[PDB]
Amino acid sequence: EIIPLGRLIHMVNQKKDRLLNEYLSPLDITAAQFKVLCSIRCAACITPVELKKVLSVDLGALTRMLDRLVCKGWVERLPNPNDKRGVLVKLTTGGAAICEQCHQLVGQDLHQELTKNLTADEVATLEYLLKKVLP
Amino acid sequence: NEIIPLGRLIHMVNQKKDRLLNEYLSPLDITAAQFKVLCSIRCAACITPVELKKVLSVDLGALTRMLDRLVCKGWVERLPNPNDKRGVLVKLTTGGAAICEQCHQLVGQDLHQELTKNLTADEVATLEYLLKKVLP
């Protein structure tokens, strides 16, 4: 079984997203929706266009999603001081809290599930070598 | 030198992979999304748009448009579903089959080369072995 790095990373990413959906279930929020909140939380404010690039998802589906999350009271649209035609989306108090709960709920378990087939010895090597690919 | 969790690490390294994929594909005039679609249609010789939406976890709106674009290119043809009659079975043309193979070479080598730039062959081997362990 020889399998190229790129494909392995894809497969392991997808599985992580499966588990994300599972562990986010109690809070009625998908992995896709959650990634959005996080990206918005890393900036203070960000535009849909800028948010599309970071997330790498379709602009239209993202715009529908952004609106779902607005109904949920998690995301609000400020008018861009610079653009005055584009909008800066940011998290609400509710959005920031709901986002932080999601982290607290998902985080420990997802890691523990992903790494159930590995020694803490091997887990460290894996983290180390994945770090090497990034810079 | 900070403890970043496996979950976030895999995301960052995946996202980097996706970006490099886009770069190495511009010369061929075909997007990363369009490329993944061709590969999925390739893997399942014949597939429903619905079934394909599921495999790709994308919007059925985006996909149906994307399918239309690829039909224009002549890489994808629609057959009527013998099982349905309300559905279609998309599949690859010889053209689309060729283009998909050609992209898998063109980005096959170089994506790997760029990703493993800072890694010993022994480290790459160790990396692949540990990633595999996560998948069962």
Side-chain angles (χ1 to χ4, degrees), chain A residues 1 5-6 8-9 11-13 15-16 35 54 115 117-118 122 126-127 129 131-135, chain B residues 2 6-7 9-11 13-17 115 118-119 123 128 130-136:
Chain A
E1 291 266 12
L5 190 61
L8 281 181
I9 279 147
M11 288 174 68
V12 176
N13 189 61
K15 189 195 187 208
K16 172 199 72 76
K35 289 175 172 171
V54 174
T115 64
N117 285 322
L118 290 152
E122 290 163 307
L126 183 55
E127 276 167 25
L129 297 178
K131 279 207 211 85
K132 293 274 276 193
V133 163
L134 279 172
Chain B
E2 291 293 317
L6 194 67
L9 280 188
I10 278 138
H11 198 262
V13 177
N14 186 68
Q15 208 187 285
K16 165 166 176 144
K17 175 198 76 78
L115 279 178
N118 313 310
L119 274 73
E123 289 179 331
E128 279 166 359
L130 295 174
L131 287 175
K132 286 210 211 89
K133 282 205 146 158
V134 171
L135 286 169

Side-chain angles (χ1 to χ4, degrees), chain B residues 70-83:
Chain B
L70 295 168
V71 165
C72 289
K73 297 283 222 308
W75 302 333
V76 164
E77 67 170 288
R78 299 204 178 208
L79 301 174
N81 200 333
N83 283 1

Side-chain angles (χ1 to χ4, degrees), chain B residues 86-102:
Chain B
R86 257 156 99 263
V88 284
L89 292 164
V90 298
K91 64 169 200 169
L92 290 195
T93 312
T94 292
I99 312 301
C100 179
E101 209 169 48
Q102 194 181 355

Side-chain angles (χ1 to χ4, degrees), chain A residues 7-92:
Chain A
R7 284 156 67 184
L8 281 181
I9 279 147
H10 176 77
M11 288 174 68
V12 176
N13 189 61
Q14 271 204 323
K15 189 195 187 208
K16 172 199 72 76
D17 282 357
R18 276 153 153 170
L19 293 176
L20 260 179
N21 277 309
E22 204 189 306
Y23 296 103
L24 287 160
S25 202
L27 277 165
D28 285 321
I29 175 155
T30 66
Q33 291 179 341
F34 174 63
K35 289 175 172 171
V36 167
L37 298 169
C38 289
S39 306
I40 295 186
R41 167 210 175 92
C42 287
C45 313
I46 192 159
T47 59
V49 192
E50 209 79 21
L51 195 63
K52 179 200 172 179
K53 297 202 214 85
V54 174
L55 285 161
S56 291
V57 288
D58 188 81
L59 196 270
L62 168 64
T63 303
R64 291 169 150 195
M65 185 161 291
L66 278 184
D67 266 354
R68 303 178 201 266
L69 300 154
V70 173
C71 292
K72 300 251 209 155
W74 298 338
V75 178
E76 62 167 314
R77 282 176 209 247
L78 284 173
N80 194 356
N82 291 320
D83 200 359
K84 208 198 189 175
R85 98 155 151 201
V87 279
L88 294 166
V89 294
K90 72 164 199 169
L91 290 193
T92 316

Side-chain angles (χ1 to χ4, degrees), chain B residues 34-48:
Chain B
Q34 283 170 34
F35 173 67
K36 288 190 194 296
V37 163
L38 297 192
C39 290
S40 293
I41 302 176
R42 193 192 166 86
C43 290
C46 284
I47 193 154
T48 305

Side-chain angles (χ1 to χ4, degrees), chain B residues 6-132:
Chain B
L6 194 67
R8 266 198 214 92
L9 280 188
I10 278 138
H11 198 262
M12 294 167 67
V13 177
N14 186 68
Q15 208 187 285
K16 165 166 176 144
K17 175 198 76 78
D18 272 334
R19 293 191 319 251
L20 286 181
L21 201 80
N22 278 292
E23 289 185 7
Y24 284 85
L25 274 177
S26 285
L28 228 306
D29 289 331
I30 173 172
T31 77
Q34 283 170 34
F35 173 67
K36 288 190 194 296
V37 163
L38 297 192
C39 290
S40 293
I41 302 176
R42 193 192 166 86
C43 290
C46 284
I47 193 154
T48 305
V50 170
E51 217 182 337
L52 193 72
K53 169 212 172 203
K54 298 206 206 79
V55 179
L56 297 167
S57 274
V58 298
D59 182 44
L60 183 81
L63 174 58
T64 306
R65 285 166 191 187
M66 191 152 50
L67 279 167
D68 269 3
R69 294 180 188 277
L70 295 168
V71 165
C72 289
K73 297 283 222 308
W75 302 333
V76 164
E77 67 170 288
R78 299 204 178 208
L79 301 174
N81 200 333
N83 283 1
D84 207 309
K85 273 209 158 71
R86 257 156 99 263
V88 284
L89 292 164
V90 298
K91 64 169 200 169
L92 290 195
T93 312
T94 292
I99 312 301
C100 179
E101 209 169 48
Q102 194 181 355
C103 296
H104 207 76
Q105 297 174 356
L106 211 83
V107 193
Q109 177 200 117
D110 286 283
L111 185 80
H112 204 255
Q113 283 280 339
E114 188 67 17
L115 279 178
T116 57
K117 190 167 55 190
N118 313 310
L119 274 73
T120 299
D122 210 15
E123 289 179 331
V124 181
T126 301
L127 180 49
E128 279 166 359
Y129 168 74
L130 295 174
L131 287 175
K132 286 210 211 89

